[PDB]
């Protein structure tokens, strides 16, 4: 299984991660749909930046192969701990961070709480400012495994429908069931979800005093996180740039996977 | 003086024009503040554009250093039939076109009405749709000369106003005044100027028929033409792309040269 990487303690969590390419460390978070991890999300996306950077993809604790706690309590602050911890561990003094979704809305509250560790940010249709949940999210968040519902949660995050296949959706749908993985994923985000987007959202306030060149990246047509909702990242951040890419969902880097590399790269080579 | 270039007879009109570099086709429309050109507004893109494409930025008439036909009728039909004289006189079969402002409505109206002339659009702070005249738009088009009036002009197109200097106000203020530019210019755009942005429009039902890959882009804080006109040009262009620089203004290409330059080239080099 490719999903499953390397192993370290972070944060005292044991944490499964990927770490590939030498040079300036840039963190990439995943988002948070049904048997997601690290390696799923950024496949195409870190043999493209480990050619000019070392890129650490880790797997969130409630999320992909990193271990599950008992009774551990998942918080934004929690994840922002686990992704502080991951960087100590490495000896990660200051990095770049990419975040996806559920992702960004971490990469968001880490530079915000640890300013200081962090330098550039991508994020990407990411959680952050508070939206009205969408039916997309709610479909997402409220999965219940088979073959179908997996299906039409890949329709939802593409633009390109063909792209959703029988062995994808039947792939997905395994990495959906892995022992536990079902268990920890229906108890992250129950009804009402919208405290969760509220939750893993930041204040505009405090958005405001991000330093950060900011690099915010979008589907026009992405069905889980609005557009809208990073237009308003746009006016909160002062060194920002946003792209949006039509004919485009909420799988950016899979869908439009060498523009978005491209734009990603150049953006880091800036620094 | 580095404005006037190359000499060409185009719809039957002496046209001021710039070649540089080899290769596919690639023509730059400048925009229509007081004094303006070719030159002026493109001479930080055409070298590192010319460097992977043959660039081609010529006077629109009634600009410039391109004659000014007496009792010529100008008008969006005409300006585009200017365009694609200026194609024919070249032997340019098809081209990328780069619209600047009022060129952007231009290169819009030239792909509907030439489609098969025209490959890959890039429109900046572009004309093209109906939105409110904005104070800043009605000062530039209501310009008469002086240091003062260039200055506060000048202070309205960039975000950053250190880069206003007196010596800019004073080269623009003198550009403004050659011979017949201020009396072409005062009588291009008269009041009431909503009129003249619905002219150089294109409706939303053609704007939609578009098949052109697209790359939009506009400064956060552009003062002149507001973002929501490239967010409203993004949503009707299918193959499009909205690219939007915080801490930038009306003048993207020499604000964020860098970042403008590489972006446009890796845009034309996907074709």
Chains 1, 2 share one sequence.
Not at 9 to 14: C, I, N
Not at 33 to 54: C, D, H, M
Request: glycine share 8%; aromatic share 10%; proline share 4%.
């Amino acid at each position: 299984n490719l999903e499953i990487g390397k192993s370290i303690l972070a944060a005292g969590v044991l944490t499964n991660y990927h770490d590939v390419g030498e040079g300036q460390p840039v963190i990439l978070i995943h988002g948070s749909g049904p048997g997601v991890s690290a390696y799923a999300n950024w496949r195409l996306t870190i043999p493209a930046l480990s050619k000019f950077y070392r890129v650490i993809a880790p797997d969130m604790v409630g999320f992909g192969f990193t271990d599950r706690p008992e009774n551990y309590n998942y918080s934004k602050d929690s994840w922002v701990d686990h992704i502080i911890g991951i960087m100590d561990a490495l000896e990660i003094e200051k990095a770049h961070i990419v975040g996806n979704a559920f992702g960004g809305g971490l990469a968001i509250a880490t530079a915000l709480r640890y300013s200081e560790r962090v330098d550039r940010m991508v994020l990407m249709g990411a959680a952050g400012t508070r939206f009205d949940v969408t039916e997309g999210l709610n479909a997402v968040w409220g999965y219940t495994p088979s073959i179908e519902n997996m299906r039409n949660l890949l329709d939802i995050f593409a633009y390109d429908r063909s792209l959703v296949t029988d062995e994808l959706a039947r792939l997905r749908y395994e990495a959906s069931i892995q022992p536990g993985f079902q268990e920890s994923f229906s108890s992250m985000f129950p009804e009402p979800r919208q405290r969760w987007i509220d939750a893993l959202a930041s204040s505009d306030e405090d958005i405001k005093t991000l330093p950060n060149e900011t690099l915010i990246i979008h589907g026009r047509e992405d069905q889980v996180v609005p557009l809208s909702s990073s237009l308003r990242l746009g006016e909160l951040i002062d060194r920002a740039q946003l792209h949006v890419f039509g004919r485009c969902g909420h799988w950016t880097q899979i869908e439009q996977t060498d523009r978005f590399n491209r734009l990603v790269v150049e953006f880091f080579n800036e620094a």
